[PDB]
Structure formats: structure tokens, C-alpha cells
Hints:
This protein is mainly β. The chain contains no helices and two strands. The chain is globular. The PDB classes it as toxin. Keywords: Toxin.
Amino acid sequence: GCLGIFKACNPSNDQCCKSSKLVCSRKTRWCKWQI
């Protein structure tokens, strides 16, 4: 599936829930909610 919001992960293999507009930041290293 995908990684929920505010969930640890890696930017090299980001797999956040795009459906919820989430992306693993390289600095935060976690799925952040972008507007």
C-alpha cells in the first residue's frame, strides 16, 4: 500500500499515500502534508 501521514520513511524510495498528497521529505524523512 502506502505510508500514512507523519510516518517515517526514506526519500530515495518514497512510498507515501499520494492520494492524501503526502511525500517523504529528505530533511524531515517523513510523509508531510503539502497544500
